[PDB]
Amino acid sequence: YMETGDQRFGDLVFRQLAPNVWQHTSYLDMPGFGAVASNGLIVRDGGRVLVVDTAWTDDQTAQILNWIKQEINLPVALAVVTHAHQDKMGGMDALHAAGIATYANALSNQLAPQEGMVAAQHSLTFAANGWVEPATAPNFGPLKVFYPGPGHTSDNITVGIDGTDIAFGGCLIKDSKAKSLGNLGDADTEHYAASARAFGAAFPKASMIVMSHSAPDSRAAITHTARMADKL
């Protein structure tokens, strides 16, 4: 397949990362930071779609689904949400209104309501090696869900996509050229370096790491993240 150009649809941008995979990107102006990109994933598996997180708001999340209707036109079977923050969870209401089953780390679930956000309907749990208990993850298809341990946040979870060299660190992995690890308030600084490495180990073949706030990087984002994290 030939590279097609990145599609502007409403306030959203969609970059195709593979034949079955797209990155959705949405923006919100934060008080001093200007307009802040947030990335997510859309994944076409056979005759159904899977979504990785939401946009900043219920309204942009609705735009995402309209985009899926127009450009793909297959039912969205479910969404997985990688940690609790307005950028990942702020569109839960939109998903619930559309009838879509939502999953999050059991911990993201306990946390969201306090954050003033809507929880996912379903709670994922993980084995000691960090792969999801398959009982709690019905038919996730190509989606491979992994909990590295307490990270940047205690709830961060991550995912790769079978069939591809793609893997999504979310809030955990930072740009290879990053000057800081950013906000450590919910971070576990003892385990942060370990978490970055477990993630890399979990997805050893992944050549494309999709970042929460920036353009997908190579594995260098991981090693760079782990090292910065060893300063703590």
Author numbering: 38 to 269
Question: How does the study describe this entry?
Answer:
NDM-1 has been reported to be a highly potent carbapenem-hydrolyzing, zinc-dependent MBL. NDM-1 is an extended spectrum zinc dependent β-lactamase capable of hydrolyzing nearly all classes of β-lactams, impairing the ability to treat life-threatening infections with intravenously and orally available carbapenems.. NDM-1 resembles the common β-lactamase fold, although it shows low sequence similarity to β-lactamases deposited in PDB (20–33% sequence identity). Our results show that NDM-1 is unique among other MBLs due to its enlarged and flexible active site, and explain the observed extended spectrum β-lactamase activity.
Three of our apoNDM-1 structures are zinc-free and are the first structures of a wild-type apo-enzyme in subclass B1. The three apoNDM-1 structures include two pairs of monomers A and B and one monomer A, and the structure of monometalated NDM-1 (mZnNDM-1 Δ36NY) includes four monomers (A, B, C, D), respectively in the asymmetric unit, providing nine crystallographically independent views of the molecule for NDM-1 Δ38, NDM-1 Δ36NY (monoclinic), NDM-1 Δ36NY (orthorhombic), mZn-NDM-1 Δ36NY (tetragonal). In our three apo and one monozinc structures, there are nine independent representations of NDM-1 molecules with different crystallization conditions and packing environments. In these structures, most active site loops show very small conformational changes with the exception of ASL1 and to some extent ASL4. These are key loops contributing to the expansion of active site accessibility. ASL1 shows the ability of assuming several alternative conformations that may be important for binding ligands. The structure of zinc-free NDM-1, along with the previously reported structures, provides important insight into the conformational changes associated with the metal binding properties of NDM-1.
